[PDB]
Subunit: 235 residues, 4 copies
Amino acid sequence: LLVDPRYSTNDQEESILQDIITRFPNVVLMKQTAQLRAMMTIIRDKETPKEEFVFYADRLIRLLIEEALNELPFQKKEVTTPLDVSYHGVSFYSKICGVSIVRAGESMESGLRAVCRGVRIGKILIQRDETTAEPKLIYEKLPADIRERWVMLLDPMCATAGSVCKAIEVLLRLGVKEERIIFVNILAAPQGIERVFKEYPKVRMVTAAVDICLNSRYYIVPGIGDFGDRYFGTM
Amino acid sequence: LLVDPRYSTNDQEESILQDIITRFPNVVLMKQTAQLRAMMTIIRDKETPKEEFVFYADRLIRLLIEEALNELPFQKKEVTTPLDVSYHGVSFYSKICGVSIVRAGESMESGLRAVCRGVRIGKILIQRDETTAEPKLIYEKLPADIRERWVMLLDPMCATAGSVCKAIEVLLRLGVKEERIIFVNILAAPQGIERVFKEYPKVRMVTAAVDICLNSRYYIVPGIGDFGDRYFGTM
Amino acid sequence: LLVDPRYSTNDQEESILQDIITRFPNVVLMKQTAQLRAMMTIIRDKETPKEEFVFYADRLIRLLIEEALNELPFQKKEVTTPLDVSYHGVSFYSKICGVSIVRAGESMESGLRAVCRGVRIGKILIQRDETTAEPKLIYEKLPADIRERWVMLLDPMCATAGSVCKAIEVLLRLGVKEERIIFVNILAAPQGIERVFKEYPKVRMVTAAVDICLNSRYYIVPGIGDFGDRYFGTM
Amino acid sequence: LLVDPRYSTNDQEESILQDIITRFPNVVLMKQTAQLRAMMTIIRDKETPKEEFVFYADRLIRLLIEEALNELPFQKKEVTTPLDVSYHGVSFYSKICGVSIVRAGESMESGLRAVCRGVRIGKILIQRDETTAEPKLIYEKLPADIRERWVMLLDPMCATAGSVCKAIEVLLRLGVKEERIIFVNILAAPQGIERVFKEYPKVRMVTAAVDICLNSRYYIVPGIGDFGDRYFGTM
Ligand SMILES: Nc1nc2c(ncn2[C@@H]2O[C@H](COP(=O)(O)OP(=O)(O)OP(=O)(O)O)[C@@H](O)[C@H]2O)c(=O)[nH]1
Ligand SMILES: Nc1nc2c(ncn2[C@@H]2O[C@H](COP(=O)(O)OP(=O)(O)OP(=O)(O)O)[C@@H](O)[C@H]2O)c(=O)[nH]1
Ligand SMILES: Nc1nc2c(ncn2[C@@H]2O[C@H](COP(=O)(O)OP(=O)(O)OP(=O)(O)O)[C@@H](O)[C@H]2O)c(=O)[nH]1
Ligand SMILES: Nc1nc2c(ncn2[C@@H]2O[C@H](COP(=O)(O)OP(=O)(O)OP(=O)(O)O)[C@@H](O)[C@H]2O)c(=O)[nH]1
């Protein structure tokens, strides 16, 4: 909802944002600070060279992952200071794991691995049909006990939501509780958010930015281009 | 009074915070999230092992530094996206540098250097006379043109504010503007904050926690123990 | 082909090692130091925890990548010191890229992105046939100009060499020069080394170790187990 | 004994190395590879920007620190692999700590902390008197039990060896055994190597390069300039 004064906002931005916040109580938008905006301009800029795009993208992913991890359950915990005085804090306890949507999502694996040393990482490779264009599971490698874990579903972009929805579908089938799936995303389109909460209303979604629309080629506008190609350098 | 509901604040902590937020317009407390508490309870725990202590402190410092970098000036900037559409963002201001208060302050250079590659770093070693107990300037190595840049003054703890005030003095005596010093701190005592803004009311302070008071041995309480010792292993 | 005194060698290791060295001019064995051995001990021990496995694996990967990058072409370059005295050095190759064999090979992408900021990364997913057992290309996303580049083929284990050979075959068809392929490998089986070189003799291979054999299920012995499962935690 | 053929060593470098390797048994010279040369030529070039200088310096210091760790004692260890067979490896010595010679040496701390998470870090500030030119101890913060540990002494340069010889002196007066000191260095001069070994013959020295001589102003030549100033950006 809140837009930082510093930067000028793209047309109808403050609007869309509030409307998303109010309509979907399960989405959590990152605080729209100038730093975030600064990083977004660098990664969204056509002109930005690959070494710069992945440095800032990695940088952003970091903030975004710490934001998502805040959606896990926490227990109350008391500890003692070296001063022998009590401090009432909390502790993470959940059994977690991250799951990336092949390629694009893998760029977020390292960010998650940096803060959570050795977190288990699953991988789902989705491919859209050549005829009708219906998502098809091509490959998947998930922890043996994923059904008893909170899942950090990783996918930088959410345009039509067909990929993440299919990903959630199988995740569910293997026994993952819908309300334990935290979908961390970088950039999303309104229609993609509705689609996901229309199908799986219990999941949580933390994004860094919500854009205007999709073009006839399913790309988000103003968007960022193809994140996977830009990040891994397969332009 | 935006303290994450999931945990219980220290006795009379919400009161202290209100006081400071009310009287000191230039202090910026970072968001008191459950995630942040999780980290604090770990490093404040006197049972925590050195490997764990530095890992989390490093982790927290990353978040604190990104927060602090928001206090810098920003230049609106327009960039064209890969979809041939304009995107209104901002641009990073340029003349800045980090200055750490030798030992404890050095632990935050890693973090600054992680997000700001090649950032100029100055050092100032202040030390109290073993008898007289007052702040003496023992050593200092700062960038030749520090007077024309924004200073990110680094020091994890702020108890009496005696050593940071001494630091700002020498910095001012070298021509750096008071309203360009962003004091980034991890943990602070109320009187510490008070003194700082009593003498140098134009600086900015970014902190993650404000404890209740100082004990007979001038230690912040609940506190965290001697940060520099626990961080570098010179227990 | 030489072993460090500190540690005791395995049966016929000094033997197998020299044999591989003299028989194949294009393989390069990392210097067998006590340090390298200490790392192989952590990651080979079935008892080591997942955080410890990835840490040391990542650590070993760094040294192995630096070793492999040495197999690239070099040009002489004279520079001048701040003491205005020339120094004769050598600048490195201008066009490379990494290519990881999906999953296991992906654990190496990070080590490569760490030393070469923004390197282009390709990906190949090979899957054997249940009956034929013949390696099949399932998915591949590669830089568009891979034909004019040197490629660092990434795959930690080389047992039968079937998958790596399948990977070389596709690269070759796309236009990559066989002698510009540098196969970075952690652990290999004599059998796999012979096959790779029997089929593509001009490629170079850098590895940290060579074990004695394969078992009925195609695992190197003493081996390390399933590197992909152990690293990503899907075991 | 080798020197990569790919690059052109400079006038009498091969002679110097020959001599030092013959006359001083305790000096460990990193393998003179083209990769290493390439980095040296980057950081030695007076034209390189601080961002690039820091990056390549950290990278080089990384390889250097791993090399020095090889000088620590190793204990044989047997581990059972996942294949259920034994593997004869080694175990890391368990009592180390890094010690930085304030400012210049602090640049190697991050490298040490990278491979040895949680290593205790001591610091010594030696400053030559502005008139007398005498090396004086200004500040020191070492681990309480440093006498029981092996110390990796950190200082990127060694011109006359007055500073380092002064640091070792204070270390010996504190209890640490002379033979437990591994002096990790990046660049050194024949003079320095001699003095350090004339006075403290039992210390171990690991370095990446040894230049021709010292400048009339006491600078290592061809050299690099002032490493601490180029590293921390205060020049
Ligand atoms: N939830 C959470 N845990 C964190 C975070 N950072 C570090 N951790 C730690 O990482 C752990 C997460 O669980 P896992 O270690 O994946 O649980 P696990 O895989 O069953 O544990 P093992 O069986 O030994 O492998 C917790 O025990 C936390 O202490 C964070 O941001 N969130
Ligand atoms: N202000 C700011 N700059 C950042 C940040 N992250 C990266 N940077 C970059 O780092 C630079 C900071 O400026 P400085 O390094 O002080 O510029 P400088 O010292 O004049 O540069 P030189 O010519 O090399 O000496 C900017 O040019 C930015 O592009 C950030 O969070 N804030
Ligand atoms: N060969 C080599 N180059 C290195 C290494 N470390 C850093 N580099 C630098 O990184 C560069 C490699 O960049 P590439 O990704 O091949 O450049 P590119 O493929 O042409 O792409 P562009 O920047 O767009 O032109 C070289 O120019 C080197 O200066 C290394 O270990 N080996
Ligand atoms: N010698 C050595 N130890 C390493 C290395 N990498 C990791 N380590 C580990 O780091 C430790 C080094 O010893 P320290 O942790 O300083 O020993 P310590 O400080 O007495 O032990 P604690 O008091 O519990 O903290 C060893 O126990 C090793 O297992 C390495 O490259 N060399």
